[PDB]
Design an enzyme around this catalytic site. Structure first.
Site, short mmCIF file in Angstrom:
data_model
loop_
_atom_site.label_atom_id
_atom_site.label_comp_id
_atom_site.label_asym_id
_atom_site.label_seq_id
_atom_site.Cartn_x
_atom_site.Cartn_y
_atom_site.Cartn_z
CG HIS F 61 21.63 30.73 33.11
ND1 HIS F 61 22.68 31.57 32.69
CD2 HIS F 61 21.35 31.08 34.45
CE1 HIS F 61 22.96 32.35 33.82
NE2 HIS F 61 22.25 32.13 34.93
CG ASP F 91 50.80 13.44 33.13
OD1 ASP F 91 49.62 13.13 33.38
OD2 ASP F 91 51.12 14.12 32.14
CD1 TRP F 126 19.41 25.42 40.01
CD2 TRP F 126 21.00 23.86 40.07
NE1 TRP F 126 20.07 25.54 41.21
CE2 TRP F 126 21.05 24.59 41.27
CE3 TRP F 126 21.92 22.82 39.88
CZ2 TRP F 126 21.99 24.32 42.28
CZ3 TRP F 126 22.83 22.55 40.87
CH2 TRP F 126 22.85 23.29 42.06
CB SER F 156 33.15 13.53 33.84
OG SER F 156 34.21 14.45 33.67
CB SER F 157 33.15 15.48 38.59
OG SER F 157 33.02 16.52 37.67
CG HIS F 240 25.69 23.74 51.26
ND1 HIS F 240 25.35 25.04 51.04
CD2 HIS F 240 26.99 23.71 51.61
CE1 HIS F 240 26.45 25.74 51.22
NE2 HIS F 240 27.47 24.97 51.53
CD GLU F 242 28.51 21.29 42.00
OE1 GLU F 242 29.02 20.19 42.30
OE2 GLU F 242 28.82 21.89 40.95
CE1 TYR F 244 30.38 27.26 51.57
CE2 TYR F 244 28.66 25.61 51.44
CZ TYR F 244 29.10 26.82 51.89
OH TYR F 244 28.28 27.57 52.66
CB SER F 255 45.66 31.87 48.29
OG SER F 255 44.77 31.89 49.38
CG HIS F 290 21.26 26.08 54.00
ND1 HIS F 290 22.55 26.10 54.45
CD2 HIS F 290 21.35 25.95 52.65
CE1 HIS F 290 23.37 25.99 53.39
NE2 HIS F 290 22.71 25.89 52.27
CG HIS F 291 19.39 24.73 49.67
ND1 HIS F 291 19.74 25.73 48.80
CD2 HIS F 291 20.53 24.43 50.34
CE1 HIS F 291 21.02 26.02 49.00
NE2 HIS F 291 21.52 25.24 49.94
CB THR F 316 34.04 32.00 55.17
OG1 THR F 316 33.52 30.69 54.91
CG2 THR F 316 34.19 32.64 53.83
CE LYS F 319 40.45 30.22 51.91
NZ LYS F 319 41.72 29.59 52.34
NE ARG F 438 15.53 31.01 42.46
CZ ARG F 438 16.38 30.07 42.86
NH1 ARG F 438 16.56 29.83 44.14
NH2 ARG F 438 17.05 29.37 41.96
C1 HEA Z 1 29.69 29.25 44.94
C2 HEA Z 1 28.58 29.83 45.36
C3 HEA Z 1 27.99 29.91 46.70
C4 HEA Z 1 28.57 30.03 47.90
C5 HEA Z 1 30.06 30.01 48.22
C6 HEA Z 1 27.49 30.11 48.91
C7 HEA Z 1 27.68 30.52 50.21
C8 HEA Z 1 26.64 30.64 51.14
N1 HEA Z 1 25.21 30.56 50.83
FE1 HEA Z 1 24.44 30.20 49.17
N2 HEA Z 1 23.67 29.79 47.53
C9 HEA Z 1 24.21 29.53 46.27
C10 HEA Z 1 25.55 29.68 46.01
C11 HEA Z 1 26.54 29.90 46.97
N3 HEA Z 1 26.25 30.04 48.29
C12 HEA Z 1 23.24 29.04 45.25
C13 HEA Z 1 23.46 28.57 43.77
C14 HEA Z 1 22.04 29.07 45.93
C15 HEA Z 1 20.64 28.90 45.36
C16 HEA Z 1 20.32 27.50 44.98
C17 HEA Z 1 18.97 27.38 44.39
O1 HEA Z 1 18.01 27.35 45.17
O2 HEA Z 1 18.87 27.33 43.16
C18 HEA Z 1 22.29 29.51 47.30
C19 HEA Z 1 21.28 29.71 48.23
C20 HEA Z 1 21.47 29.80 49.58
C21 HEA Z 1 20.48 29.49 50.61
C22 HEA Z 1 19.00 29.15 50.27
C23 HEA Z 1 18.03 30.31 50.44
C24 HEA Z 1 16.63 30.01 49.94
O3 HEA Z 1 16.46 29.27 48.95
O4 HEA Z 1 15.69 30.56 50.54
C25 HEA Z 1 21.07 29.71 51.80
C26 HEA Z 1 20.52 29.50 53.03
O5 HEA Z 1 21.07 29.74 54.09
C27 HEA Z 1 22.42 30.18 51.52
C28 HEA Z 1 23.39 30.51 52.46
C29 HEA Z 1 24.69 30.74 52.11
C30 HEA Z 1 25.72 30.96 53.13
C31 HEA Z 1 25.52 31.08 54.61
C32 HEA Z 1 26.94 30.93 52.55
C33 HEA Z 1 28.27 31.08 53.29
O6 HEA Z 1 29.21 30.11 52.80
C34 HEA Z 1 28.87 32.47 53.15
C35 HEA Z 1 30.03 32.73 54.08
C36 HEA Z 1 30.65 34.06 53.65
C37 HEA Z 1 30.71 35.16 54.41
C38 HEA Z 1 30.00 35.21 55.70
C39 HEA Z 1 31.49 36.39 54.03
C40 HEA Z 1 32.96 36.50 54.50
C41 HEA Z 1 33.15 36.43 55.97
C42 HEA Z 1 33.49 37.40 56.84
C43 HEA Z 1 33.92 38.73 56.39
C44 HEA Z 1 33.49 37.06 58.31
C45 HEA Z 1 32.61 37.90 59.21
C46 HEA Z 1 31.13 37.65 58.90
C47 HEA Z 1 30.14 37.56 59.84
C48 HEA Z 1 30.41 37.56 61.31
C49 HEA Z 1 28.67 37.53 59.47
N4 HEA Z 1 22.65 30.22 50.15
C1 HEA Z 2 28.34 29.75 37.78
C2 HEA Z 2 27.05 29.98 37.67
C3 HEA Z 2 26.33 31.12 37.05
C4 HEA Z 2 26.81 32.24 36.43
C5 HEA Z 2 28.26 32.64 36.21
C6 HEA Z 2 25.63 33.02 36.03
C7 HEA Z 2 25.66 34.19 35.32
C8 HEA Z 2 24.53 34.88 34.85
N1 HEA Z 2 23.19 34.59 35.29
FE1 HEA Z 2 22.50 33.14 36.40
N2 HEA Z 2 21.87 31.55 37.26
C9 HEA Z 2 22.59 30.48 37.79
C10 HEA Z 2 24.01 30.28 37.64
C11 HEA Z 2 24.88 31.22 37.06
N3 HEA Z 2 24.44 32.39 36.44
C12 HEA Z 2 21.73 29.51 38.49
C13 HEA Z 2 22.17 28.32 39.37
C14 HEA Z 2 20.46 30.01 38.38
C15 HEA Z 2 19.19 29.37 38.96
C16 HEA Z 2 18.49 28.47 37.92
C17 HEA Z 2 17.14 27.96 38.40
O1 HEA Z 2 16.40 28.76 38.98
O2 HEA Z 2 16.84 26.76 38.22
C18 HEA Z 2 20.53 31.26 37.65
C19 HEA Z 2 19.41 32.09 37.42
C20 HEA Z 2 19.47 33.31 36.76
C21 HEA Z 2 18.44 34.31 36.77
C22 HEA Z 2 17.09 34.07 37.41
C23 HEA Z 2 16.13 33.37 36.50
C24 HEA Z 2 14.74 33.25 37.13
O3 HEA Z 2 14.68 33.01 38.35
O4 HEA Z 2 13.73 33.41 36.39
C25 HEA Z 2 18.91 35.43 36.18
C26 HEA Z 2 18.28 36.64 36.01
O5 HEA Z 2 18.77 37.58 35.43
C27 HEA Z 2 20.29 35.12 35.77
C28 HEA Z 2 21.12 35.94 35.01
C29 HEA Z 2 22.49 35.68 34.82
C30 HEA Z 2 23.35 36.61 34.12
C31 HEA Z 2 22.92 37.96 33.56
C32 HEA Z 2 24.58 36.12 34.11
C33 HEA Z 2 25.65 36.92 33.62
O6 HEA Z 2 26.48 37.40 34.68
C34 HEA Z 2 26.58 36.19 32.69
C35 HEA Z 2 27.72 37.08 32.20
C36 HEA Z 2 28.84 36.22 31.63
C37 HEA Z 2 29.70 35.73 32.52
C38 HEA Z 2 29.70 36.31 33.91
C39 HEA Z 2 30.60 34.58 32.27
C40 HEA Z 2 31.54 34.73 31.12
C41 HEA Z 2 32.75 33.91 31.49
C42 HEA Z 2 33.30 33.08 30.61
C43 HEA Z 2 32.78 33.05 29.24
C44 HEA Z 2 34.43 32.20 30.91
C45 HEA Z 2 35.40 32.26 29.77
C46 HEA Z 2 36.61 31.57 30.28
C47 HEA Z 2 37.81 31.47 29.65
C48 HEA Z 2 38.10 32.05 28.28
C49 HEA Z 2 38.92 30.70 30.26
N4 HEA Z 2 20.64 33.84 36.14
O1 LIG Z 3 23.89 26.68 48.75
O2 LIG Z 3 24.56 28.02 49.53
CU LIG Z 4 23.32 25.66 50.47
#
Ligand code: HEA
Ligand code: HEA
Ligand SMILES: [O-][O-]
Ligand SMILES: [Cu+2]
Ligand SMILES: [Cu+2]
Ligand SMILES: [Cu+2]
Ligand SMILES: [Mg+2]
Ligand code: NA
Ligand SMILES: [Zn+2]
Lengths: 43, 79, 98, 49, 105, 514, 47, 261, 84, 73, 144, 58, 227
Positions: F61, F91, F126, F156-157, F240, F242, F244, F255, F290-291, F316, F319, F438
């Site tokens: 998934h 292009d 993953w 690819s990327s 991490h 990834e 962003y 925007s 932080h992970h 952030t 923005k 999890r």
């Molecule tokens: C695209 C998705 C995405 C994005 C953008 C981010 C954004 C952030 N993530 Fe996240 N994060 C994930 C996807 C994402 N993460 C995933 C996939 C994991 C789990 C991976 C795994 O273990 O499988 C993860 C897990 C994860 C961890 C690991 C926790 C753990 O395993 O125990 C941490 C730790 O700090 C973290 C922190 C944050 C923070 C600080 C941001 C910051 O970038 C957020 C900044 C945003 C805001 C703050 C809001 C807007 C701001 C304001 C309105 C300003 C005012 C705010 C303040 C003064 C507080 N994230």
């Molecule tokens: C981009 C990333 C992404 C997205 C969108 C989602 C979407 C969903 N995920 Fe998540 N999920 C992950 C990335 C993502 N997930 C990751 C990183 C983990 C951790 C894996 C690990 O632990 O190793 C995880 C783990 C995870 C868990 C925890 C599993 C566990 O710990 O045992 C659960 C639980 O419900 C969950 C549920 C869902 C559900 C219900 C959706 C639903 O929201 C899905 C609903 C459908 C959509 C939101 C997308 C449909 C959009 C399109 C089809 C695009 C079509 C586009 C065009 C036509 C142009 N996911």
């Molecule tokens: O990885 O937030």
């Molecule tokens: Cu991170």
């Protein structure tokens, strides 16, 4: 935005058939597998 | 001094969560002390402290494999 | 001790590479490699926009440090003005007569 | 001129709203779903031995 | 920007340019509509007159529609503007969108 | 004809279409997998079998949604379609290489599908952490097929990144400076820089995992002096960045969408926005640990990683507030795309704030590996990245196709999905604070209510995606062609009509050197 | 250029008949959604 | 008459991207077949189709630039960026391996004896062959620079001569390195020291071979007068890739061979 | 050490040819000399069955699966000691 | 007739913003201080109250007598 | 008058509050009577009848501001259809429960949860705020 | 040798409507077809192997 | 442990968990503030016919929206770091216990004086005695003296595992070849549950941890009866 009228308009009826076939192509295959889940688990 | 205690005390040489070297060092120190004292016709009880400490901290599996290796001639540490 | 033997661009360059090379030494730019210098942009001294057809998109950076370029098609005919600053642009033909 | 919404909007809104509430209430209470809500205030503690 | 007075003046002059073409009439109104304000009656007056010079009745009516729209929720602004413009509306025979019934559906 | 066009393409528009098609398909696979997950957890007990078959599903998934849906769509799809149109380029710089970036994806996906078919699949998560991913706990071809899939996706990327950076930097009108390119173009240039620097470290890490499994190396095996923790560092150094990389192009689209539907010429604080994206990019490379807050690292380094992770909220925040400042005073058009964008602004904020909680190492001790982290990331991914994708899709669909969507249906679609994703993930905050781990296929009785509500929410989203397919059909079935588009003066991509001709800008734009 | 242009011509699938399109779209997205379910079944049927 | 008025290159639809992608599928699944089901057929098919794709793809690039004249200055500029960006990613790739080495050698675990190099490992002397390799590679950085200048000055004979010396030095390093691999008392299976040593130096060694053939390609293109005194990007890229390979070695030598032993 | 050879270590095909034959190549010769008056040969290390060496978690995909790719019988022992 | 007085015509949006921006801070600091007292302060008190007249031995005994432990019957 | 796809490069008509005066008139092609109305327009507007004035407006613009800021009942259809489909979702759940889901663990029956709550109350589960703090140990009844 | 890039320039600039990968002559065509064949065949072989390995094989 | 329909953290059994609860209330208050602020501004921006579509100045308000968040982060960070540093002063434990994760069960070792070692498996749901918790009961609990600072050392003999007990505020990964240290300190007697918190294979969900905290004297006799 702004556009011409449909060249081949999809009437309510056609949409109903279109939505139906769409949902079904998603639900039937999955339902079949899930329905027989236990049937696969018992070896 | 006391060759009787509660448990391995805090050691400033290993102040963090990773205690791997604490077990290892005390395990080496002991066998190194055991040799000298048991070789130069000395007192092996001076080495007691280290055995208590390494016994407290070291997982049984590590102590067993290291002992099997010291006997086998393949213990990587310098004793 | 030099004995030569390697071709020069003047003698071996071909196709478009040669074309932009020759055109370059004659002071021209048929391939839009250089940025066009603006005239005053008044109704009487419009910016002359060359084109190999009858319309070309114009991007007007109204003021020096603007982050948004104003875009629009300039057609063959009378001088048209930028929707934002009124600067004038008039289409003119390119090296290849349409 | 009158559009789809002016004509059917009200029907669509009401019958859709009504249908939603019924199927959900039924599913949430008539089939065997175990919600397992908090025992506090609900369950009478029974001796376990 | 500049002092409010200079802003108003600058616009009165813009629309009062005797040889103003339609492009400049449109550009002027379309630009003025992006500001945080309902244009002063004296600015509307001049734009209305420029419409007369360009023989554009419709644009004069749409300019009045725009003044009411920019007032948003402040419903006392339009009537006040229509009031100060009355001498001019009567002179050029400009009917208000309400008189033409354009505030309909 | 079909082959020359569709298999041997060297056209940015056709390649971009190929990507959108691939990503749409992968999204269905990813959606099915997400439902198998919630089906397993919607009732106490076990449905599929053990955590192995379960985690094979959880792992796929994640890879499918991240590497095969979000990236192909946002970068390869919208990227190839829009980048050249926005800078007036004929292009991409390397059109043939660009085509290889796309064609490496189907093979890559096959290898991922294959890994779940041979032996017992890869139930590693993953993150594919060793020793669980090593040749003992996961003997067989599965994990190796998974590593190879990641290699092709990385190549690819990387090739795509070289293409986007070279294009964006070398192919603009001579008079246009970088500070005159729209925000989306900036968003993809920065993302490309991130992919360029991060993907190679992943590739090195998984290559080491591959040698440990087959060539008797011991980079991660304590027996030979290796350290399983080393893998974590390398994976998360990429991991991490990834996330962003997954949100930046979305920041770009939002925007454009917010600006367009507020009737503005430009977004508020253009340079503040460029600055913000660069900052987020830079800061996202120095916070990886932080992970790994429960791994046993020194307290001082944990203090650094929590401090550093938190400052990413400042850029952030500028923005989020700039998008709000853009709406300010706008003439708002409540289109489907605008609805998708407003939901993103709020939901992404919730998901990001929830990320600040987790940034605290002290507090992460008890939140790590619980469903509280699953909630955070789904808020930013399912209601962040995905919401930008949907907004970008309904907004630009007319440019790509020349046909319009039925706006009423599109809004019905937004409403359903908005309810579904919130019902699905909101309750998971509770499960996490209360301790549910999890990667569990079953749970202690107390966690039943929230998991039941959550699984139900996922079914609502399912309805939403089936509806979406119908919506695309009806547009192509009805064929309402586009006539006029508003605001073309500040939106170049629309100036060549809908759809733009195969070859656009055969004659460059004319831009004065003022 | 040599390729067809305009609405419904810049895509690898034909859109000249909504019903055949329905079918192609059904197989396309349908097959994608069906795959995981059949992989899970296949894994259950080995032991 | 009347067509494009920009200086960029619109490339003809090519099948190489498709075959190159399929090659990748064949090599990876072929490696999966060799590693587990003990067969090299798939891997062989894959390696063959990959060489065929690279040959034709790059052949076409020569056709388009040297023969068809499509490499205008705007196009050449893009190619410079592309090559620079490519080297950067390669640098980060090697960074993962140095990270691993440094991580292992600076915190030697108990199962190694708590020291570096691990007990039981007899490292090579950095003052013998590794010093040689170092001087051979640095020498070739000098000769390639002479080649470059000869080219720019229009001297065909010397460019060809300097290029030749460069190549033999590269081949010489490759042979010396192959000898060392065979004479070495430790192997890739000798724990983290062996892992760290053979994969980090094995990849560099693979890069030296890639650079040598690239230079060989430039050598033949020069024999056939493809390069002009001002337009010769293929040689510049070959030269930059070669200095990168040289630099990576200096780091290897200092890190793994000297400090790490 | 350090370095400083008067001047001319930049610009001119003649200067680089000069450095190629007057500095670069002569170094390659000296190091080749050095590597000859050292590398005569090494007597093989004693075989001690250390567990952190001769790792075998999975047999190599070639030959008998117990010999590393560039196996030299003279200096590389198998997990069970030297072959001869 | 009656002349309508001249109303305010400039900065109507800005004027609207200045007002609500304050109300925005009010409403948001309300939710926060509300969480503080209805939740944060209630909990500091709950822990402080509990551990004041707490006896671990009395608690253990009640537990021991109920048969929960496996090391103290 | 009647716009065409291929006129994308030409100026277009559009109705929007922030661009009140479009770049083009709604009607480009005048009939005999309209050409005449356009001529009367060159004279005093006091002479035009209200109908002539309306016609003049409808020649230049498509919709009035009042017509363009018109509110629809679209939201009703949107909320209604959304609820309908959300309602349709419950049926998939009902199906799931009946043909896919088996029986839940025996620990969910009344007997067990009653014993289990007692044991929980005995081990003092969450005694400060969460579970046991809501139980009256003295009256053997839930606090209320 | 002799400088012959000018002949080549001629052969390749010849407006014969052939794409660059086939413009060189008849060997381009055989190479091309050999390449496409090994790729398609090898890919089919590959799918088969995947099909074989996906089943428990004793 | 967790009860049905729980919203927040499990009640705190130790002093650092209490600290964390309060730090979390602090942090949650701020996220409610920021999130409700953003929602108000958004609704505020979308509810007026007043327009102002021409350009606005960028720099002016940007300082407020850069400087404010910076202050708020310092308000979250200070408490956070203090507690973080507070978690590492183990300082003079009276007992050291080791736990080794294994593929599908935990094993404990009390080795200060004797060589007491035992395996702890999940009690299968079909062997549960009425009133026992489904996937949470273990056959052999880990007995420890209440009100004492205990040093726990976590490690593993196979894949990674993670040893956790929510109510006590503990979670330490179990990594092969490594010894991670944490400090356990309960302020009440009782049974406290936890679960493997790192994916480890087929039975990852089925290898719980149960702590039994009794007075010292009862701990001692228990040690002896366990060999
Ligand atoms: C695209 C998705 C995405 C994005 C953008 C981010 C954004 C952030 N993530 Fe996240 N994060 C994930 C996807 C994402 N993460 C995933 C996939 C994991 C789990 C991976 C795994 O273990 O499988 C993860 C897990 C994860 C961890 C690991 C926790 C753990 O395993 O125990 C941490 C730790 O700090 C973290 C922190 C944050 C923070 C600080 C941001 C910051 O970038 C957020 C900044 C945003 C805001 C703050 C809001 C807007 C701001 C304001 C309105 C300003 C005012 C705010 C303040 C003064 C507080 N994230
Ligand atoms: C981009 C990333 C992404 C997205 C969108 C989602 C979407 C969903 N995920 Fe998540 N999920 C992950 C990335 C993502 N997930 C990751 C990183 C983990 C951790 C894996 C690990 O632990 O190793 C995880 C783990 C995870 C868990 C925890 C599993 C566990 O710990 O045992 C659960 C639980 O419900 C969950 C549920 C869902 C559900 C219900 C959706 C639903 O929201 C899905 C609903 C459908 C959509 C939101 C997308 C449909 C959009 C399109 C089809 C695009 C079509 C586009 C065009 C036509 C142009 N996911
Ligand atoms: O990885 O937030
Ligand atoms: Cu991170
Ligand atoms: Cu475990
Ligand atoms: Cu586990
Ligand atoms: Mg973890
Ligand atoms: Na389950
Ligand atoms: Zn301008």
């Amino acid at each position: 935005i702004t556009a011409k009228p449909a060249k081949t308009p999809t009437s309510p009826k056609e949409q109903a058939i279109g939505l139906s076939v769409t949902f079904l192509s998603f639900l039937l295959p999955a339902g079949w597998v899930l329905y027989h889940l236990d049937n696969y688990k018992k070896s | 001094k006391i060759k009787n205690y509660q448990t391995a005390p805090f050691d400033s040489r290993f102040p963090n969560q990773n205690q791997t070297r604490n077990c290892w060092q005390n395990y080496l120190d002991f066998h190194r002390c055991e040799k000298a004292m048991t070789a130069k016709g000395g007192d092996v009880s001076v080495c007691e402290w280290y055995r208590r400490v390494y016994k407290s901290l070291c997982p049984i599996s590590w102590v067993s494999t290291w002992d099997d290796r010291r006997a086998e001639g393949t213990f990587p540490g310098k004793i | 001790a030099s004995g030569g033997g390697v071709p020069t661009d003047e003698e071996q360059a071909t196709g478009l590479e040669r074309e932009v090379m020759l055109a370059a030494r004659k002071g021209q730019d048929p391939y839009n490699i250089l940025a066009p210098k603006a005239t005053s942009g008044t109704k009487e001294d419009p910016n002359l926009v060359p084109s190999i057809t009858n319309k070309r998109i114009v991007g007007c950076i109204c003021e020096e440090d603007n982050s948004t370029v104003i875009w629009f098609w300039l057609h063959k005919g009378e001088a048209q003005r930028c929707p934002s600053c009124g600067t004038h642009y008039k289409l003119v033909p390119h090296q290849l007569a349409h | 001129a009158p559009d789809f919404h002016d004509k059917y909007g009200n029907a669509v809104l009401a019958s859709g709203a009504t249908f939603c509430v019924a199927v959900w209430v039924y599913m949430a209470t008539q089939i065997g779903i175990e919600w397992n809500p908090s025992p506090v205030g609900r369950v009478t503690p029974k001796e376990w031995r | 920007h500049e002092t409010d007075e200079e802003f108003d003046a600058r616009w009165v002059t813009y629309f009062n340019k005797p040889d103003i073409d339609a492009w400049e009439l449109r550009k002027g109104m379309n630009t003025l509509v992006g500001y945080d304000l309902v244009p002063e009656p004296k600015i509307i007056d001049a734009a209305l007159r420029a419409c007369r010079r360009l023989n554009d009745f419709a644009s004069a009516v749409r300019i009045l529609e725009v003044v009411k729209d920019k007032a948003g929720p402040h419903k006392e602004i339009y009537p006040y503007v229509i009031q100060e413009l009355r001498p001019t509306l009567n002179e050029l025979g400009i009917s208000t969108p309400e008189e033409l019934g354009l505030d309909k559906v | 004809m079909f082959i020359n066009r569709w298999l041997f393409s060297t056209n940015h528009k056709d390649i971009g279409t190929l990507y959108l098609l691939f990503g749409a398909w992968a999204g269905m696979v990813g959606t099915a997998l997400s439902l198998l997950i919630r089906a397993e957890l919607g009732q106490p007990g076990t449905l599929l079998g053990d955590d192995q078959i379960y985690n094979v599903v959880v792992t796929a998934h994640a890879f499918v949604m991240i590497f095969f849906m979000v990236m192909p769509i946002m970068i390869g799809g919208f990227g190839n379609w829009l980048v050249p149109l926005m800078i007036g380029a004929p292009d991409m710089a390397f059109p043939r290489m660009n085509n290889m970036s796309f064609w490496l994806l189907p093979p890559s996906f096959l290898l991922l599908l294959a890994s779940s078919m041979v032996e017992a699949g890869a139930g590693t998560g993953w993150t594919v952490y060793p020793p669980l991913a090593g040749n003992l706990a996961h003997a067989g071809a599965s994990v190796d097929l998974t590593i190879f899939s990641l290699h092709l996706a990385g190549v690819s990327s990387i090739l795509g990144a070289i293409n986007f950076i070279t294009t964006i930097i070398n192919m603009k009108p001579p008079a246009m400076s970088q500070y005159q390119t729209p925000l989306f173009v900036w968003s993809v240039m920065i993302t490309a820089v991130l992919l360029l620097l991060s993907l190679p470290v992943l590739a090195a890490g998984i290559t080491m995992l591959l040698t440990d499994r087959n060539l008797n190396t011991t980079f991660f095996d304590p027996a030979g002096g290796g350290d399983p923790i080393l893998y974590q560092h390398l994976f998360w150094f990429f991991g991490h960045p990834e996330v962003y990389i997954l949100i930046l192009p979305g920041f770009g689209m939002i925007s454009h969408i917010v600006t367009y539907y507020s009737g503005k010429k430009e977004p508020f604080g253009y340079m503040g926005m460029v600055w913000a994206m660069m900052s987020i990019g830079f800061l996202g490379f120095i916070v990886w640990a932080h992970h790994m807050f429960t791994v046993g690292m020194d307290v001082d380094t944990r203090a650094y990683f929590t401090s550093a992770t938190m400052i990413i909220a400042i850029p952030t925040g500028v923005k989020v507030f700039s998008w709000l400042a853009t709406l300010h005073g706008g003439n708002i058009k409540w289109s489907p795309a605008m609805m998708w964008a407003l939901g993103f602004i709020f939901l992404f904020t919730v998901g990001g704030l929830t990320g600040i909680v987790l940034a605290n190492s002290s507090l992460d001790i008890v939140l790590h590996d619980t469903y509280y982290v699953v909630a955070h990331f789904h808020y930013v991914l399912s209601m962040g990245a995905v919401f930008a994708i949907m907004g970008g899709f309904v907004h630009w669909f007319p440019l790509f196709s020349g046909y319009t969507l039925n706006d009423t249906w599109a809004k019905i679609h937004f409403a359903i999905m908005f309810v579904g994703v919130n019902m699905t993930f909101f309750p998971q905050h509770f499960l996490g604070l209360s301790g549910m781990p999890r990667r569990y296929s079953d749970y202690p009785d107390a966690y039943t209510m929230w998991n039941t509500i959550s699984s139900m929410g996922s079914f609502i989203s399912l309805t939403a995606v089936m509806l979406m397919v119908f919506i695309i059909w009806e547009a192509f079935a009805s064929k309402r062609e586009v006539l006029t588009v508003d605001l073309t003066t500040t939106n170049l991509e629309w100036l060549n009509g809908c759809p733009p001709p195969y070859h656009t800008f055969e004659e460059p734009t004319y831009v004065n050197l003022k | 250029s040599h390729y067809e242009e305009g609405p419904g011509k810049n895509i690898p699938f034909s859109v000249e008949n909504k019903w055949r399109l329905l079918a192609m779209m059904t197989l396309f997205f349908g097959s994608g959604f069906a795959a995981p379910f059949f992989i899970v079944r296949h894994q259950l049927l080995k032991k | 008459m009347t067509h494009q008025t920009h200086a960029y290159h619109m490339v003809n639809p090519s099948p190489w991207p498709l075959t190159g992608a399929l090659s990748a599928l064949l090599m990876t699944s072929g490696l999966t077949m060799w590693f587990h089901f003990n067969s090299m057929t798939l891997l062989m098919i894959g390696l063959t189709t990959n060489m065929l794709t690279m040959y034709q793809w790059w052949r076409d690039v020569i056709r388009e630039s040297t023969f068809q004249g499509h490499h205008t200055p705007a196009v050449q500029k893009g190619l410079r960026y592309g090559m620079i960006l490519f080297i950067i990613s390669e640098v980060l790739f090697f960074t993962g391996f140095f990270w691993a080495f440094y991580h292992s050698s600076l915190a030697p675990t108990p199962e190694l004896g708590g020291c570096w190099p691990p007990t039981g490992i007899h490292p090579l002397n950095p003052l013998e062959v590794p010093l040689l390799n170092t001087s051979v590679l640095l020498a070739s950085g000098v000769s390639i620079t002479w080649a470059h200048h000869s080219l720019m000055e229009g001297d065909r004979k010397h460019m060809l001569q300097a290029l030749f010396i460069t190549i033999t030095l590269g081949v010489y390093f490759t042979l010396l390195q192959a000898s060392e691999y065979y004479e070495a008392p430790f192997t890739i299976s000798d724990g983290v020291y062996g892992s760290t040593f053979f994969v980090a130096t094995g990849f560099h060694g693979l890069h030296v071979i890639i650079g040598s053939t690239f230079l060989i390609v430039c050598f033949f293109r020069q024999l056939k007068f493809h390069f002009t005194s001002n337009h010769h990007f293929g040689f510049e890229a070959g030269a930059w890739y070669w200095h990168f390979v040289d630099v990576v070695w200096l780091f290897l030598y200092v890190s793994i061979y000297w400090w790490g032993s | 050490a350090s370095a400083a050879k008067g001047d001319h270590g930049g610009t001119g095909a003649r200067t680089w040819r000069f450095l190629t034959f007057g500095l670069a190549l002569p170094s390659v010769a000296l190091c080749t000399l050095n590597s000859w008056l050292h590398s005569g040969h090494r007597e093989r290390p004693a075989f001690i069955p250390y567990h952190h060496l001769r790792i075998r978690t999975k047999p190599f995909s070639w030959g008998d699966g117990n010999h590393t790719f560039f196996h030299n019988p003279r200096v590389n022992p198998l997990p069970t000691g030297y072959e001869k | 007739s009656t002349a309508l007085a001249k109303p305010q015509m400039r900065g109507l949006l800005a004027r609207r913003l200045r007002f609500h921006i304050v109300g925005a801070f009010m409403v948001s600091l309300g939710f926060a201080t509300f969480y503080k007292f209805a939740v944060a302060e209630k909990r500091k008190k709950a822990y402080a109250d509990f551990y004041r007249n707490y006896d671990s031995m009395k608690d253990f005994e009640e537990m021991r007598k109920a048969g929960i432990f496996q090391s103290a019957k | 008058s009647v716009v065409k796809s291929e006129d994308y490069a030409l100026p277009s008509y559009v109705d929007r509050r922030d661009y009140p005066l479009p770049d083009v008139a709604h009607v480009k092609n005048l009939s005999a009577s309209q050409k005449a109305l356009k001529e009367k327009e060159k004279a005093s507007w006091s002479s035009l009848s209200i109908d002539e004035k309306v016609e003049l407006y409808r020649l230049k613009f498509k919709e009035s501001f009042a017509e363009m800021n018109r509110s629809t009942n679209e939201w009703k259809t949107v909320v209604g259809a959304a609820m309908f489909f959300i309602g349709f979702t419950a049926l998939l759940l009902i199906w799931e429960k009946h043909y896919v889901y088996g029986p839940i663990p025996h620990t969910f029956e009344e007997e067990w949860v009653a014993k289990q709550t007692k044991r929980m109350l005995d081990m003092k589960v969450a005694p400060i705020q969460g579970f046991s703090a809501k139980w009256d140990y003295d009256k053997n009844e839930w606090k209320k | 040798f002799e400088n012959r890039v000018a002949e080549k320039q001629k052969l390749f600039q010849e407006d014969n409507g052939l794409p660059v990968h086939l413009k060189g002559g008849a060997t381009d065509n055989i190479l091309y077809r050999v390449t496409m064949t090994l790729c398609l065949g090898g890919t089919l072989y590959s799918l088969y192997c995947l099909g074989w390995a996906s089943f428990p094989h004793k | 442990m967790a009860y049905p329909m729980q919203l927040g953290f499990q009640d705190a059994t130790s002093p650092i968990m209490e600290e964390l609860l309060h730090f979390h209330d602090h942090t949650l208050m701020i996220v409610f503030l920021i999130s409700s602020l953003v929602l108000y501004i958004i609704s505020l921006m979308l509810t007026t016919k007043l327009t102002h579509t021409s350009t606005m100045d960028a720099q002016e308000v940007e300082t407020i929206w850069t400087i404010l968040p910076a202050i708020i982060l310092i308000l979250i960070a200070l408490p956070s770091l203090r507690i973080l540093y507070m978690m590492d002063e183990i300082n003079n434990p009276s007992l050291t216990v080791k736990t080794m994760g294994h593929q599908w069960y935990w094993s404990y070792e009390y080795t200060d004086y004797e060589d007491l070692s035992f395996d702890s498996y999940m009690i299968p749901t079909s062997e549960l005695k009425p009133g026992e918790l489904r996937l949470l009961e273990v056959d052999n609990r880990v007995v420890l003296p209440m009100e004492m600072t205990i040093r726990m050392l976590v490690s593993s003999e196979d894949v990674l595992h993670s040893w956790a007990v929510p109510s006590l505020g503990l979670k330490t990964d179990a990594i092969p070849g490594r010894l991670n240290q944490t400090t356990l300190m309960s302020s009440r007697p009782g049974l406290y549950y936890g679960q493997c918190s790192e994916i480890c294979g087929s039975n990852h969900s089925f290898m719980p941890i149960v702590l039994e905290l009794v007075p010292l004297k009862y701990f001692e006799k228990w040690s002896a009866s366990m060999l």
